[PDB]
Amino acid sequence: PLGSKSSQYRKMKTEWKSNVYLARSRIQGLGLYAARDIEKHTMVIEYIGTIIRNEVANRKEKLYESQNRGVYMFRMDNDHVIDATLTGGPARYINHSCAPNCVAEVVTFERGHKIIISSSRRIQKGEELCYDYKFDFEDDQHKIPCHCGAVNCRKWMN
């Protein structure tokens, strides 16, 4: 059952621009920031992009990696990935943190899945938005370091 998720989603779609702005991250590169105070359990922004198949995502990642082009992919389900590297929305910029103030969740409408970024606590204007990426844990030569800067940081994004 959808509960209030349809209304929340549609309301978020008409005012997400008032919730966020883009700026230099204290964590890495660019990030998204709260343009205003955001209450707990608020739908903030949708992760938007081009829906691609798994093997497409594997080919594209190697091409993206060929160009030092970062990770802008978000898995939608077992068979599909949202690629936001070349086209999509500003949610691609939300950084990872060990002390996250947002969560990422799939909402299942009949017209398709949507990746929604929601508040897990009250967020104050000017705070950087961040969620747990939940990257697949991997090997050392792979291993990627974390600079979320929070106290009790796990030190790795894996």
């Binding site: 992760y47 798994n54 995502a57 594997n58 594209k60 990642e61 990770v71 992919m73 978000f74 898995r75 990935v81 990872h96 990422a104 969740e105 799939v106 990746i115 990426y133 939940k134 990257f135 697949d136």
Partner: peptide
């Protein structure tokens, strides 16, 4: 490939 995830 490496992707952000919900779970």
């Amino acid at each position: 490939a490496r992707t952000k995830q919900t779970a």
